[PDB]
Structures are given as structure tokens and as C-alpha cells.
Amino acid sequence: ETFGTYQAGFLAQLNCPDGLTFPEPYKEVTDASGNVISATGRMVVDDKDPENKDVTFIKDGNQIIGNIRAVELYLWYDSYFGDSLTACRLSVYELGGNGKETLNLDNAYYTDINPEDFYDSQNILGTKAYTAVDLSVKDSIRNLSTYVPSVHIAFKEDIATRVGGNILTAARKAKNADKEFNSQLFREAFQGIYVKSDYGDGTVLYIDQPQMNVVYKCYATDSITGKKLQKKDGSGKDSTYYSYRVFATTREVIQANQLKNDPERIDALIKEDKNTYLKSPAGIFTEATLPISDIQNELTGDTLNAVKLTFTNYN
Amino acid sequence: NIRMHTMVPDSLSWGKDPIANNPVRNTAEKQKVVTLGDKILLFAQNNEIYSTAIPAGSPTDRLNYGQKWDK
Amino acid sequence: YAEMLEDEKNAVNKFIKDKGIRIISQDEFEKNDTVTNLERNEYVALSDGVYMQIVDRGSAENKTDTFANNNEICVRYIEEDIMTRDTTCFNVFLEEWGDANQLYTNPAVFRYVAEGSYVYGTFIQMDYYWASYYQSTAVPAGWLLALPFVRNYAHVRLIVPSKVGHSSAQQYVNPYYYDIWTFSKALN
Amino acid sequence: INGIAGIVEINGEKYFSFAEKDVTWEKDIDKLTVVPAEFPINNLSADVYATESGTLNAIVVGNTEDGLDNDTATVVWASEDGKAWIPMEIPSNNNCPKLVDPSIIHYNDAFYICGKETKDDAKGFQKFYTSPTLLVWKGVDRMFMLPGILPPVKSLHESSFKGKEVNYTMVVDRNHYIWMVGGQGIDKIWRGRVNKLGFLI
DSSP states (O other), X not given: OXXXXXXXXXXXXXXXXXXXXXXXXXXXXXXXXXXXEEEEOOBOOOOSOGGGTTSEEEEETTEEEEEEOEEEEEEEEEEEESOSSOOEEEEEEEEOOTTOOOOOTTTTTOTBOOGGGTEEEEEEEEEEEEOSSOTTSOHHHHTOTXXXXXXXXXXXXXXHHHHHHHHHHHHHHHHTTTOOOOHHHHHHHOOOEEEEEEEOSSOEEEEEEEEEEEEEEEEOBOTTTOOBOOOSSSSOSOOEEEEEXXXXXXXXXXXXXXXXXXXXXXXXXXXXXXXOOOOTTTTOOOOOOOOHHHHHHHTTTOOOOOOOOOOOOOO | OOOOOSSOSSOEEOOSSOSEEOOOSSTTXXXXXXXXXXXXXXXXXXXXXXXXXXXXXXXXXXXXXXXXXXX | OOSGGGGHHHHHHHHHHTSOOEEEEHHHHTTSSSOOOTTTTEEEEOGGGOEEEEEEOOOTTXXXXXXXXXXXXXXXXXXXXXXXXXXXXXXXXXXXXXXXXXXXXXXXXXEEEOOSSOOEEEEEEOOHHHHHHTOOXXXXXXXXXXXXXXXXXXXXXXXXXXXXXXXXXXXXXXXEEEEEEEEEEOOO | OOEEEEEEEEXXXXXXXXXXXXXXXXXXXXXXXXXXXXXXXXXXXXXXXXXXXXXXXXXXXEEOOSOOTTOOBOXXXXXXXXXXXEEOOOOSSOOOBOOEEEEEEEETXXXXXXXXXXXXXXXXXXXXXXXXXXXXXXXXXXXXXXXXXXXXXXXXXXXXXXXXXXXXXXXXXXXXXXXXXXXXXTOEEEEEEEGGGTOOO
């Protein structure tokens, strides 16, 4: 009621460790009779099988390079500001596009960059409703010392296919050229994310680390001969499991914030003359003028033993 | 003095019986209820209105109302 | 043993002779411009007994953004024990542990202090493996001797004796070998 | 904020619009917003309340259009002002069932919903559904039951809602009495309040 509406959001690039790659496609080897003798690779590659309707296969040229099961974002946070039962909604967009700018060492670290020229509204990845204390999770779990809260905003199948396919094809394109898939090559496939607040009044989350998982399907393979393992239960066709690679913002890449105060209210409060404010998030500072000349005139020849300045406040 | 409740605090009290009949003629018709000032209004689609009035105030006081409805 | 443990120089000499490695004095390193040749596997004999090889001096097009006081530096590395030839510490990706996502996702980050004497550094963020295994925040002093000789995004290889190692290497008197895949100025 | 929120069909397409105090609806098509296909159409119910931050909020439920894909739950739509409504969609299993003619209230520091179900094995009004934070919904298996559900005096009252499938309407007055009015098949007026709201404490 004194300062007006405060609103915040952030932009973040995702890192990729040097040489990170997805497991190679599973490839059979057969002798002249057609009987399988050995195999290499681990990732599921064969379609048309009703057992593989759980994933989407992805390609370059006319060859299948792998599969995508899901893509999911976790925004981990230790703490927050404000009420913790007000319902809020959050939405996330992919950075970059035709004619947009990109984050760099000069654009970032100012608290009032305009995100509308870093991203395009049609590249929405997903949305989530949240409460900063998630009562959907049982108290028994939320009491654990290993529990860190997060908002989990996993994508729809079409978006998951697009993003995961781009990342996986970039990784393959780097590997096939005997390069290594450093973060600058990842940034060509997925520029970053913009996180925006649509609805809700009261919560400000302190997102500590945004994290993205890319999930895929793999066979289990024999330790000596490399073939697929058969399922140990009755019936069955083959043994498979799901695995993932992780991409996160880890201080080797750029992250920026928009911290928007209500400008007219701030400008009005700066003009009060009975008092001074100290509004912290890029708001108001207070400036003091020391009487150095008077000290230099009146106490020349003295040894100064203490010079005390005190600022004091209302409730 | 050992002070003890005479009725359970966090319990929705409906009473033994409904406090009044529905005043609308041809009860198949659509219904709507709304409050205005110190009256509760019940509207029916066939241009038909019924009403009842609320006492002076203070929700914690020993109020009784709703047993009578007027056209 | 008290003084017998200072025979780490025998193990370092073993580790040198086991591989193709040549030793260059600093007075020669600073006079053939500045490079340890990789075809000949050169290493410089630095101060306090550190042996160091620059594989990429870093930031070759800009050439100006060197390290300095009050910087925060991100480190990615893999640590090899000299006495028993074993990979002991790392925070980088390799296929042999590719699915262990906890080990390599986050780097180590330290503040660099370079006042008129006694250069030292403190970890702000330790990597998961270091944070669980060694649990101490003091940077190996051998690393800090390399910063004045390299630039941003440099790749260097170091042999570090016990006198300038970390809180375990100083007690159990064990030299180590570090393959520093990258020094970076910290962003965000 | 002061005004009325509604839906206007500009040039044959539906938009959310807000009529501020004593002035006409906004009709500027460049800065209204389009109504989603999932939004309720008939028998709307609404409530307005103050968040703990001092900001008003509004919530609505109602009947959808006659048929639409992958719909199995009674989602509630919220709005911080009158310009654009936003759905409280729930990814997990904590989402309340599909209801016919649903009604919603904010009451004794919680949210409650009532309506009649159509699963053919437990038709009719069966229970209230409650939420502490608007994003997870539970059925109340104990106190705060539907009207006419008596405790053991040693039962179901003839004019009770429980198990009935009828037309109805409800409101909450400024003494926090729940008023429930039944149509054909109930023919009665029910009145109730949780005892904790009448205490002086």
C-alpha cells in the first residue's frame, strides 16, 4: 500500500558439460543365416513395434538417431518471500528467434532489461500453478532433510518432441564431426528460458537453479555379448528402462533478472522531505553530506579518537 | 472453574429439520437466490419473487430468521 | 615416519619417468616467448616445486581478459593420485561415469585474492564430489601459481607437491596431478 | 478495482470485458482477450475475496459446452482483476470430479464446492469438496456434510440433498449462514453455519 506493485521475472541460459553425449543407437550384427551374433549401443531405435508407442523417434536425413520420452523443467528453490498459500501461475518461454537480441556480458546485470526483445510469445514451453508450499505433497515427505521444494513444469508432447529433438540432433551433429558438444554448440539448439508471472499476488520465489531433463528409452544389454536382455517375468518381448541427461544454469552461463518497481510511486516517495527511505530492490538509497570542512577547521591539531554517525528509523 | 464446550466447534449445524418450505409455485422452475441490504430474495423464472428479512446485526448475537417468506 | 614422508620427490620422479615428459626451467619458459610445447611434452619447473604445462593459454583473440584480484573463477578438473595411480577427484563428463549426473553438473568456484603478498583463494561453491569427500574450502595453493601465466578459458596440467596441496595432501604428504580442463571468469 | 466483469461477442467472437464504475464496457478489440473454449457457459457461480496480501481475487465454476476432448474434472478459473481469467489446472490426481451445476464458496478460511455427479453408480449430490489452497481438492468424509445428514441419536432425513438429482441454488449471507434452496424433489429451504463462526471465543 505504500510502494505499489512489485513484479519480477528472470532469463537464464542452460549449460552443457564439455563432451556430453547421449548413448549411441542400438545396432544389431548378423551372420549369413540372419542369426544375431553381437550388438553395440544402448538407445532404442526401432519403430513400428507396439511396445515402442511410449516414445517418439527422431531423425535427420532419413535415419533414426534416437528417441524422446519427455522433457521436463525443475525450478528448485530453498526459500521465498510473502504468503505461502496464495495460488499463483507461472509460464515459461524459449529465448531467441528471428531478429531478437541475445544475452551477453553487456546486456545482462542491469535490473530493467526489457524481455520482449529477447523472446517471442509464440515459443511458449508450458505453464504451472503453484503455492510456494505445495500441499499436494504429503507432510511425511516435506519433513525430510533431503527435500528441496521446486515447481515442476514438464512440457506437452509436441513441445517435448521439438526441444528434445533439437538438442539430440545437435549432440549427434557434433559427435559425428569429431567435435565436442560444448555449451556454445548447445546454445544453437536451445537458447535459454524466460520465466514470467501471469497471476497471483504475494509470492516471490528465490529460484536457485533452473534444471532441464531430457528423457529417453534404453535397452538393457548383456555384459559380454552386448545383446538385448529378455524380460525376467513371464511373457514379455525385451527389457528396457528410461534414462536422462541434465542441463542446468551453473555459473558458467548468463542469467538475468527484471525487477520492476512502480516508477511513479518511487518518484513520488523520493520527493518527500521530512524523511528518507531505503527501498532495497533497486529502489531508493539515502545520501549524506559529511561536514569535513568544519572538522578540518575546528579540530586541527587534535588526535581524533572516534567519529560516530547514526541513522535511525520509524517503526 | 473448568470451562467446557456445549457444542462441537468445527461442525456444520443444519438442525433436525429444514427451517422452511420452498415458496415457489411449480417447483420445477429454475431458481435463484441473492441478498441485498437486509433482505434475502428468491427469484423464479415466471416473473415471481419471494423475500425474507434479516435482523439488526452482530453475527455473534442470538439471531433467528428465515421461518417466514413473503411475496 | 616423520622426515621419511618427504620422499615424495621419488614418487614425482617415478611419475615423470613413467611418461614422456621434459622439464624446462622458468628462465627458459619465459624466453622462448611463453609456451610448453605439446609435441615434446614440456613442463615448467615453477616455484615451490610445481610442474606445470599450458595446453591452451586461452582467450587467443581477445588476449586482454587475464585474471586478477577479487575475481571469482570457475574450475573444471580431474584429479589423479601420484602414489597410487588412481583417479581420485573430478567434476567433468566422461563416458565411464556418464549417467552419474550428480558428479559433473556443477563446477567449483573460488574467490581469488592477490594483495601485495600471500596469494590465496577460497571456494564459494564446491562441487558435489569435493564437498562430500574433502569437505574443506581452501584452494590448492599450487593452482594459484598458474593464474599469472594464463588467460580466460585456459587449459593447464599441473603436478602439485604436498607443501602446496589441499588439506588432505598436506597431512598425508601426497602429491597430485590435475588436468584443469578450464579456468573461467565467473558469469552470473 | 470497481466494476462488473462479463463476456461480450465483438464482431461474432467472444472476449472478456470489464465495465468500470459508471462507464461502458471496453470494446477495443486490440486490448481485450479471447475466451477459451474450455470456459464455462451456463449456470455460472462466482465468489470474490481478499487475499492475505490485501488484494482481491475472484473464482468461478459452472457448466461447460456440451462436449469437448479429454475433460474429466471441475476446474476453477481465477482472476486478479476483470481483464483476463486464468484456469487452475491440476496435473496430479488431486483434481475434483466432474460436476453438474457446480457451486463454489470461500468460507471459514477455506474453499468448498458442491454439485451432483453422473457416474451412474453414485449419482446425485454425494458430498462437499474442499481445498485449503485452491490447487488440491479433497472430499470431506466427516463434519461439514450435506444438509439432512444426521448423527446417531440412538440417519437420513427425507428432504436431504444426499443422493438427490434436482435443481437448486445457494448463497452465503453476512452472518455466514449457508442458504440452500431445493427444487422439485426436495421442495425445502435449508440453513446452516459452522458453530465456530458464532462463538465469542
